[PDB]
Amino acid sequence: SLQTSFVTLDEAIKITNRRVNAIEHVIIPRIERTLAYIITELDEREREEFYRLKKIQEKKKILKEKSD
């Protein structure tokens, strides 16, 4: 009753320790280096609107001094 209990646990500990090592080394470092890509792609648009808005801030002054 323990000999047939011994080998059925080593078939269920191996197909569990792979799913630990599939999450730890494949699923999470795919999500982690995706989340590092959303951060920089947010940043490359947050400095893109800083160039368009500062262009209007200079063009609101040149149009002002043309009136003055």
Partner: protein
């Protein structure tokens, strides 16, 4: 022109008109309350000035009094033990002169006291008519019992002596020297004014060779730092940041210690001004306060953000001035991550382009132009003296991650990184410096000192590091190595800072303890290569001789070496049995 008028204030900025002779980055005095401002643009006759203080109540037409000097400090006597802000106003004197608890927002109090009199002595073969160039030691002022504040010449000017002062007592406004040049007989007092963005001129830089004995066993042996070197540490709440900031001020071989609290907190800055006025240092005579060789740049986050950027540059100019007298200055910058959040406000007010994660384009260039102001270097001047500046800069990353536009920029310039861990501070492993991530690029330059002095040290460290390197893979899954590495981590690397001896050890004990723990190791490597369980049971008394070696009190100086001989030969016996 002498004055300028305001002609409009729109926030921190003031576009002062009627300023035709105004240069860039000059300091001005805006308003009747005389707020300190900085000239930042120059449009012909007008000059756009950003003002350091709150510009509330500044009307159009207030006098803007220009000074003609850039952002500069006052270097001279009366600087030891004082507590400054980022723009060098004395916080201790500003509380007794005004009798309040707030900074009065307009006080132009002099940085050095113009009432305390100092005993001046001349250079004694510095005669009248003798030629003197910039950087020459001109006199000596006994500022304390510890610091001989050598009066120097400013590096700009030059000439021949015409009027010198007799030995006596003088003020900081009394004329001490008068120099003949081709044009004008120029006179100047004991106080020199030097801009912080301009590097102090010097003769020739030297390679740094003499290691900073900071006191701990893990730092001075395994991850050493040299005077004239740069060093970064992490900046969490509790790992070891109060220890390494104050043990390096108490027990190191540095002549002065200049601490820069760069926009820290409210109460974390209050505990530094509660602890540093009452620390004590054991000189060869009787004990004395640490405030006779310490200067503090205290700065909260409530203060102006141009006095938070300039707090680093003020603290390094005080550090580079005491370098030129021949002393071995060390500077603790705490922190630099709160300085990088001060550059983002300064460049953010000018609407400049945020390059990497908010921080401006010159974050990597302002840090590299500050850590390059360290180094052992033969100073200017005819007495031919040598000095050094060591910069220790705490890095406070968000969340403790080492991938950050200021953390990755700092660890590319520094050479020593004493990685302090919170996990080692949770388990009360003090001091909590990690040994896996930490390193030193300062090992190749120190073996000349470890051969001219201290000859049997470099085979030990290059072996005991591999013992700690082999132990991490073995702990993942040789049995001799796991026991002796436990002895090094519990006796050698661990260090209690409150024990009357183990608060500070010299290097001869530090090379002594690692000698025995390695001589026990290779003998036990042989003794198994001919039984390990009998070794752990029959040698239990000599393992007590190893684990109790740390208690060699400083009443035992030669005996501490003598006990290291007799505990060595006792290991020679039992290895054959």
């Amino acid at each position: 022109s002498t004055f300028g008028y305001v002609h409009g204030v729109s926030g921190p900025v003031v576009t002062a008109c009627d300023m035709a002779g105004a240069a860039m980055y000059e300091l001005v005095r805006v308003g009747h309350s005389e707020l300190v401002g900085e000239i930042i643009r120059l449009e012909g006759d007008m000059a756009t000035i950003q003002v350091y203080e709150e510009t509330s109540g500044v009307s159009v037409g207030d006098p803007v009094l220009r000074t003609g000097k850039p952002l500069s400090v006052e270097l001279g006597p009366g600087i030891m033990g004082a507590i400054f802000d980022g723009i060098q106003r004395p916080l201790s004197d500003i509380s007794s002169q005004t009798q309040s608890i707030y900074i009065p927002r307009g006080v132009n109090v002099s940085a050095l006291s113009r009432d305390v009199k100092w005993d001046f002595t001349p250079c004694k073969n510095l005669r009248v008519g003798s030629h003197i160039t910039g950087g020459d030691i001109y006199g000596i002022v006994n500022e304390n019992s510890l610091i001989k504040h050598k009066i120097m010449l400013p590096p700009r000017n030059r000439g021949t002596v015409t009027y010198i002062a007799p030995p006596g007592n003088y003020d900081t406004s009394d004329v001490v020297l008068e120099l003949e040049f081709e044009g004008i007989k120029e006179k100047f007092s004991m106080v020199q004014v030097w801009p912080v963005r301009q590097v102090r001129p010097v003769t020739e830089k030297l390679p740094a060779n003499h290691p900073l004995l900071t006191g701990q066993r893990v730092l001075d042996a395994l991850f050493p730092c040299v005077q004239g070197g740069t060093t970064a540490i992490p900046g969490a709440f509790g790992c070891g940041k109060t220890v390494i900031s104050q043990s390096l001020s108490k027990y190191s071989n540095s002549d002065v210690i200049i601490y820069v609290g760069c926009g820290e907190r409210g109460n974390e800055m209050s505990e530094v001004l509660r602890d540093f006025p009452e620390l004590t240092m054991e000189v060869d005579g009787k004990v004395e306060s640490i405030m006779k060789r310490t200067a503090l740049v205290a700065n909260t986050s409530n203060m102006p953000v141009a006095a938070r950027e300039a707090s680093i540059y003020t603290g390094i100019t005080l550090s580079e001035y005491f370098r030129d007298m021949g002393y071995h200055v060390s500077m603790m910058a705490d922190s630099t991550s709160r300085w990088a959040e001060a550059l983002r406000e300064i460049s953010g007010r000018l609407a400049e382009m945020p390059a990497d994660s908010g921080y401006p384009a010159y974050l990597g260039a302002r840090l590299a132009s500050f850590y390059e102001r360290a180094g052992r270097v033969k100073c200017l001047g005819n007495p031919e003296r040598e000095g050094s500046v060591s910069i220790v800069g705490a890095v406070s990353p968000p969340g403790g991650d080492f991938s950050d536009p200021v953390t990755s920029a700092t660890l590319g310039i520094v050479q020593v990184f004493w990685g302090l861990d919170k996990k080692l501070a949770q388990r009360k492993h003090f001091p909590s410096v990690n040994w896996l991530i930490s390193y030193s690029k300062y090992m190749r330059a120190l073996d000349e000192y470890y051969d001219k002095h201290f000859t049997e040290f470099v085979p030990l460290r290059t072996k005991a590091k591999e013992i700690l390197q082999e132990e991490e893979d073995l702990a993942e899954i040789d049995k001799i190595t796991l026991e002796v590495a436990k002895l090094i981590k519990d006796d050698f690397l661990q260090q209690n800072g409150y024990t009357p001896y183990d608060r500070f050890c010299p290097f001869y004990k530090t090379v002594g303890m690692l000698s025995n723990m390695i001589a026990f190791y290779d003998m036990a490597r042989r003794a198994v290569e001919t039984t390990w369980s009998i070794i752990r049971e029959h040698m239990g008394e000599i393992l007590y001789k190893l684990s109790s070696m740390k208690f060699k009190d400083p009443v035992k100086d030669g005996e501490a070496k003598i006990k290291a001989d007799y505990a060595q030969l006792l290991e020679d016996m039992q290895n054959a049995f």
